[PDB]
Amino acid sequence: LSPVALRQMSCAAGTTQTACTDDNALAYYNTTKGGRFVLALLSDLQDLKWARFPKSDGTGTIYTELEPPCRFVTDTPKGPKVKYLYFIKGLNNLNRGMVLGSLAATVR
Amino acid sequence: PVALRQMSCAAGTTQTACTDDNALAYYNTTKGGRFVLALLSDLQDLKWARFPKSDGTGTIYTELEPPCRFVTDTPKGPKVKYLYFIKGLNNLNRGMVLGSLAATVRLQ
């Protein structure tokens, strides 16, 4: 599925599945007709293992576990600020590259 | 976390026909030169890519995969661009390019 399909929105992550404070991370996802496929998260925080995204073709939300994070330091106007990138568990090399691609390909 | 940069380069239908800047090369930095991952071009018949070398020991000729169509929005209306991966480029790196491509040109 094409790279024109990849966009971003903030969403809700958590140490546990219950503790998903709304909107504390950026999520990379692909849109298609009617729903979405989240692929990875970017957050200020390093302890995350759960992700809460809108249910495709429905009202409501999904919860799927994350990989161990990927630590990057980005250049900010507030001095360097360190971010964490979580992929969805088992994300294939192409799609990882697409987010790494796009990520290095929008900041720093 | 490895930023992708652009540069004009030479490409052509055959190693000898590579005469002089009709293509755009996405490349990396690998501790002693630049590593090229793919090219983008108006021309659809390209098969080879001509690069000199930091030193100038002479020049490297790399093969290309078959192109992929992408129509781009430009001031001068729409322009169609073809994206050639260098032959034998693994999946992570293709993703990195495609993620980057969507950040650097007006796809769709």
Side-chain angles (χ1 to χ4, degrees), chain A residues 4-26:
Chain A
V4 75
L6 173 88
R7 39 205 58 163
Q8 299 174 32
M9 75 207 197
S10 68
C11 70
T15 41
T16 68
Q17 190 261 278
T18 324
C20 277
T21 313
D22 267 41
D23 287 10
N24 51 28
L26 270 154

Side-chain angles (χ1 to χ4, degrees), chain A residues 44-63:
Chain A
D44 290 34
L45 322 155
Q46 43 158 328
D47 54 13
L48 292 191
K49 323 174 91 42
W50 284 99
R52 173 196 238 245
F53 194 84
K55 213 291 185 290
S56 35
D57 251 8
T59 279
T61 49
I62 68 133
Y63 304 77

Side-chain angles (χ1 to χ4, degrees), chain B:
Chain B
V2 57
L4 220 53
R5 320 203 188 269
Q6 279 93 246
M7 93 192 164
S8 273
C9 70
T13 185
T14 188
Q15 46 280 88
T16 166
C18 289
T19 182
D20 321 323
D21 276 28
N22 45 332
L24 205 75
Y26 303 96
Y27 73 94
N28 242 346
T29 50
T30 176
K31 334 184 217 90
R34 319 149 302 209
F35 167 61
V36 162
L37 295 66
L39 322 186
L40 174 86
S41 191
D42 308 270
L43 323 157
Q44 182 181 15
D45 53 342
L46 308 167
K47 268 143 202 305
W48 284 91
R50 188 210 81 85
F51 303 82
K53 195 20 52 175
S54 325
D55 40 323
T57 70
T59 75
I60 288 116
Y61 281 84
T62 323
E63 250 170 282
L64 299 172
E65 298 230 344
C68 328
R69 220 201 206 246
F70 284 100
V71 279
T72 69
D73 286 308
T74 87
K76 314 209 285 187
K79 253 66 202 287
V80 48
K81 305 265 181 182
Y82 304 98
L83 171 53
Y84 307 84
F85 299 120
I86 77 168
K87 215 181 75 183
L89 181 65
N90 68 344
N91 280 317
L92 195 68
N93 284 321
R94 311 192 188 228
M96 307 204 64
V97 161
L98 283 186
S100 165
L101 172 67
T104 53
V105 307
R106 311 195 54 206
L107 297 170
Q108 213 90 331

Side-chain angles (χ1 to χ4, degrees), chain A residues 2-100:
Chain A
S2 161
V4 75
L6 173 88
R7 39 205 58 163
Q8 299 174 32
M9 75 207 197
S10 68
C11 70
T15 41
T16 68
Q17 190 261 278
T18 324
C20 277
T21 313
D22 267 41
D23 287 10
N24 51 28
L26 270 154
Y28 292 75
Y29 61 95
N30 286 320
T31 39
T32 200
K33 194 215 136 42
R36 308 166 167 119
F37 309 93
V38 82
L39 307 179
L41 277 144
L42 192 68
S43 197
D44 290 34
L45 322 155
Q46 43 158 328
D47 54 13
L48 292 191
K49 323 174 91 42
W50 284 99
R52 173 196 238 245
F53 194 84
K55 213 291 185 290
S56 35
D57 251 8
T59 279
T61 49
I62 68 133
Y63 304 77
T64 171
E65 328 182 61
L66 302 174
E67 307 213 317
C70 271
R71 183 220 204 244
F72 301 132
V73 47
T74 89
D75 302 328
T76 83
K78 273 162 137 273
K81 286 275 141 203
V82 48
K83 293 292 201 142
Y84 297 99
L85 170 69
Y86 307 80
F87 311 91
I88 69 181
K89 199 243 166 235
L91 179 74
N92 45 283
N93 295 352
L94 206 78
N95 281 110
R96 303 164 22 101
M98 183 161 313
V99 313
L100 298 171

